[PDB]
């Protein structure tokens, strides 16, 4: 199917506790493959997936140089945006950046993106046409003019529709044994009595990849969005994901409720029902 | 905006020198480039906001840094003859992907020893009466001779002020001994004025030659960085 | 590939008013931009034009530059060349994936020779202000070439243009002298 490569950058100022904390991570789909931490002793881009370890020394040299350079510019930008928003040097602030590319099954460019945040809110984003910017406020409009002058969009577009897609293709091939796998959800249902007249039905999906999954409860074949608890999809820590959905049902009405599981790995959607 | 000190450096092989650069006010990036006759301009190293950003094809005996005030120092140790080059600092308001503003450069000369270096002898040659008769123009010729190496700046001073109008100097010095590889140099310059201006004895002409030589080690003379000047007053004769 | 920048010709001496073509080639096509500089003695480098990888050409006054990234070629055109254009013209690129350092050609040493309105080529002898003499060849046209003498004891300088601003007058000159006494100037530059 379709695949993505995404880089995430976080810079956090820490007044009177040294220069900003910088953490960079690289992902192919839901699999992390590189990290950099400004606080770590290595001061190198580090591998986090087996299949990136087959890149040569020139790869690690360039990635280390370019990730450090990104942290340096983001350090300057924290100072500039603090100026734009008339904020004290005494307060901590956060710049977050995400950029990357999507490809289809054929490995051809699908879309590119770059989004920038300040203190957890949209600051500036490259539009889908990769030619123009959306600035969130009057501070971001100054950045927009600077970025237009320096042809940021033109250079970023060449990266996103070229370099990004080329290296994503390369990573998908080298890591194909793990990246192009689909682990379907192992599914079961549990019954937990609350009182004499109530019980919890919990529908489980375990050990699945990728992360994207839909768990929904129906009563008499009718969607039950209300009286439902749906926890966020969570990592198992072994490269697979877990999720569950729960309904509070009257005692002796368990057979009325069905759980519906949709995942890439499943040939067709699974229907589960309580089995005493 | 970009300043580099010192302008000239003369040292022997095996010695250590420090090249200084100040970027344009508010600039974040400092780039170092070496311009030699063999390789032309070659990237050495670049800094951003006080930290190394990238390193070129630079030797271990070559090191540098950018200080908190964003001024940079380039240290060249165990100097060889091949290190003789023009060393350029360039600064940028950003990373330098679009703009790099170059300083005037520091010219380094590395020699076997400092026994071969000598200051210039300077002479002002008076205009030909044949020229004055034929053109009503008077060309003063200045000639700097017997200097090594070729680190000289020649200027014309008329009545206590430097002039550029009617002046032109040889593009580079000439070798007095084209055979000898340690050949001493000569440089000539022309200052042309009206027949009237030369003929007025109230006018004073001075050819100033700033020589860059050698706190250094030293029997005949001491070839230090000095100004050698020759003079010729106007005459009705 | 290893990025190498090469420029043709290495040197060009031309009369003023001519439209000039300065050539630049590079081995690797993965560049962010290509930048043309002029270098003048003791003044360092001054930017002329910056061409983005996405741009086909850039214009700045009498300067026009083309970029064929696939062919690894750039051409700088100097229209109606003036004496003030005389400098070393440097072609430079920045590599994709790098942090903006310039990769330079060795340059084209350009000399634009001023047109001499009223050529009056004469050789004069000058005497030292303080026995010592020099020969001055002056007021010759810009087609005239001054080559170093045969005799080893005879020194001859390159030709040189001065400008007397108050009279709007330009003239070429070259100096010749000898270690030998009573040097004849007649055939010094001949």
């Amino acid at each position: 199917g379709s695949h993505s490569m995404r880089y995430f950058f976080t810079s956090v100022s820490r007044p009177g506790r040294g220069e900003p904390r910088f953490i960079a991570v690289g992902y192919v789909d839901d699999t992390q493959f590189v990290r950099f931490d400004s606080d770590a002793a290595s001061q190198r881009m580090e591998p986090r997936a087996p299949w990136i370890e087959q890149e040569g020394p020139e790869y690690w040299d360039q990635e280390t140089r370019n990730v450090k350079a990104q942290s340096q510019t983001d350090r300057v930008d924290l100072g500039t945006l603090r100026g734009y928003y008339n904020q004290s040097e005494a307060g901590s602030h956060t710049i977050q950046i995400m950029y990357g590319c999507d490809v289809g099954s054929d490995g051809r460019f699908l879309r590119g993106y770059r989004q920038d945040a300040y203190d957890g809110k949209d600051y500036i984003a490259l539009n889908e046409d990769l030619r123009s910017w959306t600035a969130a406020d009057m501070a971001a409009q100054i950045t927009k003019r600077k970025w237009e002058a320096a042809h940021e969009a033109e250079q970023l577009r060449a990266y996103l529709d070229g370099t990004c897609v080329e290296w994503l293709r390369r990573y998908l091939e080298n890591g194909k044994e793990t990246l192009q796998r689909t682990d379907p959800p192992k599914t079961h249902m549990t019954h937990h009595p609350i009182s004499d007249h109530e019980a919890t039905l919990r529908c489980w999906a375990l050990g699945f990849y990728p992360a994207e999954i839909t768990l929904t409860w129906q009563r008499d074949g009718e969607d039950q969005t209300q009286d439902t608890e749906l926890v966020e999809t969570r990592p198992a820590g072994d490269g697979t994901f877990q999720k569950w959905a729960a309904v509070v049902v009257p005692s002796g009405e368990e057979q009325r409720y069905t759980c519906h599981v949709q995942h890439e790995g499943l040939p067709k959607p699974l229907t589960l029902r309580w089995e005493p | 905006g970009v300043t580099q000190t010192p302008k000239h450096l003369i040292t022997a092989t095996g010695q250590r020198v420090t090249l200084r650069c100040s970027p344009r006010s508010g600039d974040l990036s400092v780039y170092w480039y070496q311009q030699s006759l063999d390789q032309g301009l070659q990237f050495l190293i670049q800094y951003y906001n006080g930290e190394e950003r990238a390193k070129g094809n630079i030797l271990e005996r070559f090191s540098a840094q950018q200080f908190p005030d964003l001024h940079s120092e380039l240290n060249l140790s165990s100097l060889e003859l091949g290190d003789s080059a023009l060393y350029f600092c360039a600064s940028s308001p950003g990373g330098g992907h679009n703009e790099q503003f170059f300083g005037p450069g520091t010219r380094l000369t590395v020699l076997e020893d400092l026994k071969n270096v000598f200051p210039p002898e300077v002479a002002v040659f008076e205009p030909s009466e044949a020229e004055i008769s034929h053109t009503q123009k008077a060309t003063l010729v200045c000639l700097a001779t017997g200097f090594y190496p070729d680190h000289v700046e020649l200027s014309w001073w008329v009545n206590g002020k430097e002039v550029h109008s009617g002046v032109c100097t040889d593009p580079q010095p000439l070798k007095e001994q084209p055979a000898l590889n340690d050949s001493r140099y000569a440089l000539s310059s022309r200052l042309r004025v009206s027949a009237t201006f030369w003929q007025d004895p109230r006018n004073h002409f001075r050819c100033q030659v700033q020589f860059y030589g050698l706190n250094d080690e030293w029997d005949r003379a001491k070839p230090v960085t000095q100004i050698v000047s020759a003079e010729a007053w106007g005459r009705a004769d | 590939m290893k990025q190498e920048v090469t420029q043709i010709p290495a040197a060009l001496s031309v009369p003023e008013g001519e439209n000039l073509v300065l050539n630049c080639s590079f081995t690797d096509s993965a560049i962010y931009n290509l930048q043309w500089f002029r270098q003048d003695p003791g003044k360092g480098l001054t930017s002329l034009l910056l061409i983005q990888s996405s741009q086909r050409e850039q214009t700045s006054g009498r300067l026009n530059a083309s970029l064929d990234k696939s062919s690894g070629r750039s051409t700088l055109y100097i229209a109606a060349s003036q004496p003030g254009d005389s400098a070393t013209y440097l072609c430079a690129v920045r590599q994709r994936g790098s942090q903006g350092n310039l990769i330079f050609g060795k340059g084209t040493k350009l000399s634009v020779k001023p047109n001499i309105q009223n050529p009056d080529p004469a050789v004069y002898q000058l005497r030292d202000s303080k026995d010592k003499s020099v020969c001055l060849f002056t007021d010759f046209d810009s087609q005239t070439n001054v080559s170093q003498s045969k005799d080893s004891d005879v020194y001859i300088t390159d030709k040189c243009v001065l400008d007397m601003r108050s009279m709007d007058f330009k003239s070429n000159s070259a100096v010749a002298w000898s270690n030998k006494s009573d040097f004849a100037c007649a055939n010094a530059f001949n």
Binding site: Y59, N66, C164 | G95 | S98
Partner: peptide
């Protein structure tokens, strides 16, 4: 591979 064309905000 990371993008290397860094423009200040």
């Amino acid at each position: 591979e990371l993008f290397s064309y860094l423009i200040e905000k």
